[PDB]
Swiss-Prot record, chains A, B:
Protein name: Ephrin type-A receptor 2
Taxonomic classification: Eukaryota, Metazoa, Chordata, Craniata, Vertebrata
Function as written in the Swiss-Prot or TrEMBL entry: Receptor tyrosine kinase which binds promiscuously membrane-bound ephrin-A family ligands residing on adjacent cells, leading to contact-dependent bidirectional signaling into neighboring cells. The signaling pathway downstream of the receptor is referred to as forward signaling while the signaling pathway downstream of the ephrin ligand is referred to as reverse signaling. Activated by the ligand ephrin-A1/EFNA1 regulates migration, integrin-mediated adhesion, proliferation and differentiation of cells.
Gene name linked to the record: EPHA2
Keyword Metal-binding: no
Self-association and partners: Homodimer. Interacts with SLA. Interacts (phosphorylated form) with VAV2, VAV3 and PI3-kinase p85 subunit (PIK3R1, PIK3R2 or PIK3R3); critical for the EFNA1-induced activation of RAC1 which stimulates cell migration. Interacts with INPPL1; regulates activated EPHA2 endocytosis and degradation. Interacts (inactivated form) with PTK2/FAK1 and interacts (EFNA1 ligand-activated form) with PTPN11; regulates integrin-mediated adhesion. Interacts with ARHGEF16, DOCK4 and ELMO2; mediates ligand-independent activation of RAC1 which stimulates cell migration. (Microbial infection) Interacts with human herpes virus 8/HHV-8 glycoprotein L/gL and glycoprotein H/gH heterodimer; this interaction triggers EPHA2 phosphorylation and endocytosis, allowing virus entry.
Domain Eph LBD: 4-169
Induction note: Up-regulated by UV irradiation via a TP53-independent, MAPK-dependent mechanism.
Family statement drawn from the similarity comment of this UniProt entry: Belongs to the protein kinase superfamily. Tyr protein kinase family. Ephrin receptor subfamily.
Highest taxon, organism lineage: Eukaryota
Domain Fibronectin type-III: 289-392, 398-482
Post-translational modification: Autophosphorylates. Phosphorylated on tyrosine upon binding and activation by EFNA1. These phosphorylated residues are critical for recruitment of VAV2 and VAV3 and PI3-kinase p85 subunit which transduce downstream signaling to activate RAC1 GTPase and cell migration.
Length: 482, 482
C-alpha cells in the first residue's frame, strides 16, 4: 500500500461537523452516545413514504481523480420490530461552488445501493462498505445518503485518495504522483538521477498504480568516479580509497605502494620510488624496475658461448620482464672495447623473454664480458640499471658440423661451417681410421666427400679439420651397411 | 481486456441445466417464459420465515485462481404488493468431490449481500452485479443463493476467469498465463526469442495483470544476419537484398557493382572486375582501381623540376587515393636507366595525397621522364597500373639562393646551395654594380660576404655565381640605409 490522502473523516471530527438534512425536521439526525460516540441515525420504518437526505459538506477535490468512500454502519432487521427496508442509497454531486443550505437532490448521481452483511436485532455488528468514483473534474463534490425507511445508524464516513509517494530508488528521484482513475492505470514516471549519479551506457522509470504502489523499475543511475552508493545517494570515497569509473561497485581501497588518498579520489598517487605505466589501470599497485637476473652463467661449450640466466629476485611487482644482452672485448694486450659486429646471437639480443642465448663467431683467447640486463614496463621511468656480468674466453674457432648424408657397402659425408668463417678455410681435411696406426686422409675445398672402398658393417673414426694458412671437429663413428 | 474463460453460463444453457433447491418443494423454482426465456424465481414474501437455497452444479476449477461471478436479476418492491426483504445472499463452497444432492448450507461461505440498483413495481429493470472470490485451491466449487423473503427472478449467472493470452511481441513468444488472484499482481513472464532472433548486447519480459492485460514490455529480440522482421517473425532477406548484423533494421538492397543475392544473404558478392578491401563494410559497393591522374605537368623552373597533377577522371568509387612518383634518365648518347639516388623529392615520393612534388638535384641536359601513378585501396588486388608520364630537361645546375642578412650605410649578404652540390663549387663569385660599365667582383669559398664602402640609399645589382673547374643566381636589388 501507498499514500492515502484523507478528504473527509466524520468520526475524526467528534461531532463538531454538521451536515445538511432534507427535510430539516424529520429523517436523519445526529446522535451522541456517552465516552462520546457520534453518529447519524434515521429509523422511521413506520411512516409509509420516506425520502430522507443527508448531505455532507462540500469537499475540496484538489488533485484527486478517483476517490474512495468508506462507510461504517448498522442496519436493524425489518422483522425485528413487530413499509420497511434494510438498505440505503449513496449519491454524489460534483460542483465548483459550495451552495450551502441550498441542496437539490436532482443534481445527485447515484453511486450504489448499500446493503449490510450483518443485521442487528437490538451484539454491535458493524458493517463496512467501500465504493469509489472517478474521474472527478470540478473543484469539489458532495456525498449524500438516502433513506426510504431503513433503521440505520451511520458511524463513519472516510473519503481519501491514493498517491504514489515521493521515492528515492536506484540512485534516482521520483516525484509524488497521483494514482490514476482507471484500474489498468500504470503511469510511467521518469526519474531524476541524484547528484553525482549518471546513466552510463537504460533511463530510470517507475510505474504508478491505482492503489499508489510503484510497480516495475526500469533502468538505474550509477555513482560516478570518486563516488559510491551509500544508502540512497552518492558519497565521496573515504580517505584511503578510490573509484575510477561510474560503476555499481563500492570504492576500492588503495593498492600497494601508494599514497593515502583524500576524499573523492579517482586513483591513489604513487609512493616515492614507485611508478605506473601509461597502460596500467588505477587498480594496479605502484611498481618499480626489477632487480638483476638472479644468476647468470656464461659457458664456452666448444667455439660458441652459452649464456643461461634466471629471473630477478625482485620483479618490482611486474610480469612484463624483458632481457637485453650486450658485450665487451678485452685482449689479455690489456686494451678493451665494444663487441665486434661479427658476433651473432641465437635470438635478437634485446626484448628477450627467454632466459638464455647462444653467442657465436668469437675470436679465440679474447676475454668477452657479457652483461645481461633486466627491464620491466616501468624501466623507462628511472635512469638506474639492473644487470649481471659474466666473462668467457674461447680457444678453438668453429669446427665443421658433420653428418652422414647416406651410406652403403660407402660412407657419404657432409659438413658445414657458418658463412663468415668460410673465407678463412684453405682446405678441409678428412681423416678416417678403422676402430691403431693406419689412417686415410683426403682433402677438399667443398662440403661433402664420399669415403670409398670400405669394409661392410664397420665402425670408422671420422674427423674433419678446417685448415688455414686450424680447428677440427669431434670424432664421429659411422657404420657401413650389411 | 484479455482472455475470459467461462466456467458456467446459466442463460447459455436454455433450461437444460438443473440446479438443486433446498427445500425440494418450496422456494426457488425454474420458470420458463415464452421465444423461451428461462430463470430462477422465488417470491414467498408472505411466509414469515424463509431460508430458501439454490445451489449450482459442481464447477470444475481447472487453473483458475480468482473467479468472477456475474449475476443478472430483478427484485420487486416490498411496498409494491399490499416479513419482506429486497436483497439476497450469495455463497460459495470449495470441494474436491461433487456431492450431488447431498447439500449442506453450513459448508458455504458468504460472498456478499446482493442488492438491486433498480426495483420493479410489476418496465423490465435488469440489475447487474459482479463479485469475485479467490484464491481457490480445491478441484472445484459450488455457488448458492439464499433468499429470506425477497421476490427475485434470477436470469443469468456467469462465472469466468481471466488469462493473459499467448502473445507474439518484440520478436519473442509469451505463453498463455493465468491472471493472479491479488489485485496488485503483476506476474513477470519471460519471453522466448522466435527462430532466427536473438538478444544482442535486455531480455524480453511482459507483466500479466489481474484483468489479463499484458502491461510493461522490457527488452526485445532482434532478427540476426540474413534475416529481417516481417510482421511478428524473422524472414530471409529477399533475393537482391542483404543484412550483415543483428539489428532492428530491414534488409538493405544490394549496393553498386554487385551480383544479385540469393535469399538470406549477409552480403552481396562482387561483380566481375570489382572488389572490396578487407576494411570495407558489406554496405559499401564494389570498387576498382582508379584511372590515371587526369593531367600531369612537368616544368623545369630553374634547376628544379615541378610536377603538378590532377586526380583521376575515374576514382573507381573510392576516396583513399594515393600517388607515387618514379623516374627514368636518358642521355640524348641514347642510353637509358633508372633515376640516380642523388635525386631528391620535396616529400617522400610514395603514399602521396598531395597533387604535386618538387624534384631537385638534377644533371643538366639529361632527359628525365617522370611517371606518376594513382592507386586506391583495391589496387593491390589487380596487376594493372594507372599512370601518366611527363619529360623534362634541365639546363643550369642549382644556383646560390641569396638573401640579405642585414644592412647599413653596408650590405651584408648570405647564400646557400644544397650540400650535395657544395663539393662541386671551387669558389663563389659576387658581382655588384650600381643601378652601366663599372662592376665590382669579390670571391669567397664561404657562404657570406659584407659589401663595404657603399653609397647611402642606393640600389645595387647583386649576383652570386657558383664557380667550378658554372651556375649563377638571379640579379637581386639591395638598398642601403638612410
Ligand atoms: C675479463 O676477464 C678477466 C679474466 O681474464 C676477468 O677477471 C675480468 O674481470 C674480465 N673483465 C673486466 C672488464 O674486468
Ligand atoms: C625523353 O625525351 C624526349 C625528348 O627529348 C621525349 O620525346 C621522349 O619521349 C622521352 N622519353 C622516352 C623514354 O621516350
Ligand atoms: Cl449532540
Ligand atoms: Cl466510477
Ligand atoms: Cl692440398
Ligand atoms: Cl420449464
Ligand atoms: Cl476474495
Ligand atoms: Cl680566385
Ligand atoms: Na449495485
Ligand atoms: Na457487503
Amino acid at each position: 500500500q501507498g499514500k492515502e490522502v484523507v478528504l473527509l473523516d466524520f468520526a475524526a471530527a467528534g461531532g463538531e461537523l454538521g451536515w445538511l438534512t432534507h427535510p430539516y425536521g424529520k429523517g436523519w439526525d445526529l446522535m451522541q452516545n456517552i465516552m462520546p460516540i457520534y453518529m447519524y441515525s434515521v429509523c422511521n420504518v413506520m411512516s409509509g413514504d420516506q425520502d430522507n437526505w443527508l448531505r455532507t459538506n462540500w469537499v475540496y477535490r484538489g488533485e484527486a481523480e478517483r476517490i474512495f468512500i468508506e462507510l461504517k454502519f448498522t442496519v436493524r432487521d425489518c422483522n425485528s420490530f413487530p413499509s420497511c427496508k434494510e438498505t440505503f442509497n449513496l449519491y454524489y454531486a460534483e460542483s465548483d461552488l459550495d451552495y450551502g443550505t441550498n441542496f437539490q437532490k436532482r443534481l445527485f448521481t447515484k453511486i450504489d445501493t448499500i446493503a449490510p452483511d450483518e443485521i442487528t436485532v437490538s451484539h454491535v455488528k458493524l458493517n463496512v462498505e467501500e465504493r469509489s468514483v472517478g474521474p472527478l473534474t470540478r473543484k469539489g463534490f458532495y456525498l449524500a445518503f438516502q433513506d426510504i425507511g431503513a433503521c440505520v445508524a451511520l458511524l463513519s464516513v472516510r473519503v481519501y485518495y491514493k498517491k504514489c509517494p515521493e521515492l528515492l530508488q536506484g540512485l534516482a528521484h521520483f516525484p509524488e504522483t497521483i494514482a490514476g482513475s482507471d484500474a489498468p492505470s500504470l503511469a510511467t514516471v521518469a526519474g531524476t538521477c541524484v547528484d553525482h549519479a549518471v546513466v552510463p551506457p537504460e533511463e530510470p522509470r517507475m510505474h504508478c498504480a491505482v492503489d499508489g504502489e510503484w510497480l516495475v523499475p526500469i533502468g538505474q543511475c550509477l555513482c560516478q568516479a570518486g563516488y559510491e552508493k551509500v544508502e540512497d545517494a552518492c558519497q565521496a570515497c573515504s580517505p584511503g580509497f578510490f573509484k575510477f569509473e561510474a560503476s555499481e561497485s563500492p570504492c576500492l581501497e588503495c593498492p600497494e605502494h601508494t599514497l593515502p588518498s583524500p576524499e573523492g579520489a579517482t586513483s591513489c598517487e604513487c609512493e616515492e620510488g614507485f611508478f605506473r605505466a601509461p597502460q596500467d589501470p588505477a587498480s594496479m599497485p605502484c611498481t618499480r624496475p626489477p632487480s638483476a637476473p638472479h644468476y647468470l652463467t656464461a659457458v664456452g661449450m666448444g667455439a660458441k658461448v652459452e649464456l643461461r640466466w634466471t629471473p630477478p629476485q625482485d620483479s618490482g611487482g611486474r610480469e612484463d620482464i624483458v632481457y637485453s644482452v650486450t658485450c665487451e672485448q678485452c685482449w689479455p694486450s690489456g686494451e678493451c672495447g665494444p663487441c665486434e659486429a661479427s658476433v651473432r646471437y641465437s635470438e635478437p639480443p634485446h626484448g628477450l623473454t627467454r632466459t638464455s642465448v647462444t653467442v657465436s663467431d668469437l675470436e679465440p683467447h679474447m676475454n668477452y664480458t657479457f652483461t645481461v640486463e633486466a627491464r620491466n614496463g616501468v624501466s623507462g621511468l628511472v635512469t638506474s640499471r639492473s644487470f649481471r656480468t659474466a666473462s668467457v674466453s674461447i680457444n678453438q674457432t668453429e669446427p665443421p658440423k658433420v653428418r652422414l648424408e647416406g651410406r652403403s657397402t660407402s660412407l657419404s659425408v657432409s659438413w658445414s661451417i657458418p658463412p663468415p668463417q668460410q673465407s678463412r678455410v684453405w682446405k678441409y681435411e678428412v681423416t678416417y681410421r678403422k676402430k691403431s696406426n693406419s689412417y686415410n686422409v683426403r682433402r677438399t675445398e667443398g662440403f661433402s666427400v664420399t669415403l670409398d672402398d670400405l669394409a661392410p658393417d664397420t665402425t670408422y673414426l671420422v674427423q674433419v679439420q678446417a685448415l688455414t694458412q686450424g680447428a677440427g671437429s669431434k670424432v664421429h663413428e659411422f657404420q657401413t651397411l650389411s
